[PDB]
Design a protein around this nucleic acid. Structure first.
Ligand SMILES: [Mg+2]
Ligand SMILES: [Mg+2]
Ligand SMILES: [Mg+2]
Ligand SMILES: [Mg+2]
Ligand SMILES: [Mg+2]
Ligand SMILES: [Mg+2]
Ligand SMILES: [Mg+2]
Ligand SMILES: [Mg+2]
Ligand SMILES: [Mg+2]
Ligand SMILES: [Mg+2]
Ligand SMILES: [Mg+2]
Ligand SMILES: [Mg+2]
Lengths: 55, 125, 141, 179
RNA sequence: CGUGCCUACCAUGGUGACCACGGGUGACGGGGAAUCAGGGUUCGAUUCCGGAGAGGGAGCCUGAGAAACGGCUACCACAUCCAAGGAAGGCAGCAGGCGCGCAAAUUACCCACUCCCGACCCGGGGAGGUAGUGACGAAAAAUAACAAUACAGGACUCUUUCGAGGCCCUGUAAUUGGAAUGAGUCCACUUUAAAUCCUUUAACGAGGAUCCAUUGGAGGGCAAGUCUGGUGCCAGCAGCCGCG
């Protein structure tokens, strides 16, 4: 077919964005500590009818 | 500082030897080397220090007991005869002086090719 | 309707051994045509060298031009229409390059968008396509 | 040929459904309650409890006066008492099946440290049992996954260490900075 | 040694639809492995037992034991040195090399342990053991933590408290410590035939330039965004439905 060389069009016309400086991510036991403390200690004031885990 | 004790004890009067398991206790510094444990066991056995051998030392993961096998003999001639040459090599009684690979096998090959007077000439020289 | 006597186990094993062939999976697993018909010789991966680069059309509800690599094998020697997975990589796959191929999700069927391609490009001359689609491990020049 | 060892045990159960909301919530609150690293060491405790349940049902299958049932049941009760899950009371074989997952996690090392002091925030007790600071007996304990046996249960000391044993492991840095 | 194993004569017998006979097996046979109600299904070349073979296949000396192949003779296919008249070879042993393939380790040290051979307490053993590559797979497990001061996003005990916090999760690129311990830098040990690795201890050894956790996904199954900007059935995504 004549339009076979339409390759890399999106990665050639997509503007690049510099990945900004993100802090280090605590892993393992610390990650499970923050996953427990994100959704098991101070969420129950917000009642379980509505849910807001990401927006 | 250190404390050397025995755990299991056997006696073989056929070879004039006494075998034991040695635990050295450490609430302090590192594993005591070959010389000082041998000297303290020779002092506790109250004989000449050139007769008692010991081999193997463990460590129970931070201080504690170190475990080894000790051979207390009574005769130095029986020590030179009964102990193997690798345990004579700790004090340097036996030396082989050519600890090289393929020497024996290449002498076997050079004695396998030729035979007789030429074999005694090449294989020895 | 069955046969349920104490001396009927020969009749049972004969009947189940006859009716077991009518399943598709048993006959494609224990008939030699799944060795002497397919490529790979019954394998998972095979190297191959590019013969041509052909764009195929997609199905009827999806209007797309998929990119395919006609692969000449090394082991069997069959001609295989492969598929370039990602967005670029048509510029990264040149003419007559060593290409490792695999399946999509199933040996029998193909992907519901591509009509007649069972195979998918993995490597480009001993350096994989995921690295070339990312920034590291660029091809030899 | 060679003859050294060929044996392989997998104390690891991956569940059938990978993504269950209530089960992942239960596992996350279990990890956050008992201070763990990942879910494979939850699945270890799950596999050991399931193996105990399978052995208990295999014993309860047999007749009451069976010698294998009596011997293995008395041995299993003795082992569970020496672990510390059961009491010296109900010695029934269905009382073995009437157990939960949290009992072995309570009978781990740092949870018994939490019950008997010197723990001070289980997330810090992880560091206190990784570093040589909590030592069940003269043989030094280092590994967190350690079952505290009921026979002693109280010998938690530490010798030749930083806060009480002595020495200058890193305070010599601060002292050389002040000098 | 008992045998249609062979020979001479005599009889016409023997097996089979309860699958005889003939084919294929990407078929060495098992103890076993994977798979979790039970019943089953699929592999087992592989460390232990037995069998077969040393490129194919035939014959044989010695010896108690071989149709042996790190024994021999002849044929076929390979293949080395020739000074061209002739010799010499069988890694489906240990390393290693070529080819093949998606696919698999170093021309290492030692008889120290295990046993094995021999005339023998003494010799030898790529049988084996040690070491190198190794994310086939399994076991334990830090990855920056934690207890402190303070702005408080403020849930909670209760009193008009617009808070008394001897309970508190959290953003704190805000400060202070155990300056911990771990990885690595390395004395001395130890192990070891000689080393290496496990452990011990001497001196070093973290403050975001740290000593850096990645692999896939965020429409439903299936956990998680009706966020932002381009691309506009093009690129593509998606194993299925589907989106553009
Ligand atoms: Mg399909
Ligand atoms: Mg075969
Ligand atoms: Mg099973
Ligand atoms: Mg079964
Ligand atoms: Mg037989
Ligand atoms: Mg043979
Ligand atoms: Mg042989
Ligand atoms: Mg050979
Ligand atoms: Mg060959
Ligand atoms: Mg994606
Ligand atoms: Mg969902
Ligand atoms: Mg996918």
């Amino acid at each position: 077919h004549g339009s076979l060389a339409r390759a890399g069009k999106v990665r050639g016309q997509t503007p690049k964005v510099a990945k900004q400086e993100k802090k280090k991510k605590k892993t393992g036991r610390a990650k499970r500590r923050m996953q427990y403390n994100r959704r098991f200690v101070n969420v129950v004031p917000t009642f379980g009818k509505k849910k807001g885990p990401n927006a | 500082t250190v404390t050397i004790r025995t755990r299991k004890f056997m006696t073989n009067r056929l070879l004039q030897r006494k075998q034991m398991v040695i635990d050295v206790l450490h609430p302090g510094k590192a594993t005591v080397p070959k010389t000082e444990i041998r000297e303290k066991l020779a002092k506790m056995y109250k004989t000449t220090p050139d007769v008692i051998f010991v081999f193997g030392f463990r460590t129970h993961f931070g201080g504690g007991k170190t475990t080894g096998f000790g051979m207390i003999y009574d005769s130095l001639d029986y020590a030179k005869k009964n102990e193997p040459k690798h345990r004579l090599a700790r004090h340097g009684l036996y030396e082989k002086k050519k600890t090289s690979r393929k020497q024996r096998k290449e002498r076997k090959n050079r004695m396998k090719k030729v035979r007789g007077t030429a074999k005694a000439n090449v294989g020895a020289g | 309707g069955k046969c349920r006597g104490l001396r009927t186990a020969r009749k049972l094993r004969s009947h189940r051994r006859d009716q077991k062939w009518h399943d598709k999976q048993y006959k494609k697993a224990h008939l030699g045509t799944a060795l002497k018909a397919n490529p790979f010789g019954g394998a998972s991966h095979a190297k191959g060298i590019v013969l041509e680069k052909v764009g195929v059309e997609a199905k009827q509800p999806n209007s797309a031009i998929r990119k395919c690599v006609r692969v000449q094998l090394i082991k069997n020697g069959k001609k295989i229409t492969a598929f370039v997975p990602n967005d670029g990589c048509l510029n990264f796959i040149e003419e007559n390059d060593e290409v490792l191929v695999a399946g999509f999700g199933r040996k029998g069927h193909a992907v519901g968008d591509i009509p007649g391609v069972r195979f998918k490009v993995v490597k480009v001359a001993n350096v994989s396509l995921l690295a070339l689609y990312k920034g590291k491990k660029e091809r030899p020049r | 040929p060679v003859a050294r060892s060929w044996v392989c045990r997998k104390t690891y159960v991956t569940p059938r459904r990978p993504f269950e909301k209530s089960r992942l919530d239960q596992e996350l609150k279990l990890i956050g309650e008992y201070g763990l690293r990942n879910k494979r060491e939850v699945w270890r405790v799950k596999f050991t409890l399931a193996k105990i349940r399978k052995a208990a049902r295999e014993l309860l299958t047999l007749d009451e006066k069976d010698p294998r049932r009596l011997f293995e049941g008395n041995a299993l009760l003795r082992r569970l008492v020496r672990i510390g899950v059961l009491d010296e009371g109900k010695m029934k074989l269905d009382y073995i099946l009437g157990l939960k997952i949290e009992d072995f996690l309570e009978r781990r090392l740092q949870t018994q440290v939490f019950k008997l002091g010197l723990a001070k925030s289980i997330h810090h007790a992880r560091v206190l049992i990784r570093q040589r600071h909590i030592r069940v007996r003269k043989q030094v304990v280092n590994i967190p996954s350690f079952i505290v046996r009921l026979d002693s249960q109280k010998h938690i000391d530490f010798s030749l260490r930083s806060p009480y044993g002595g020495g200058r492991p890193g305070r010599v840095k601060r002292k050389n900075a002040k000098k």
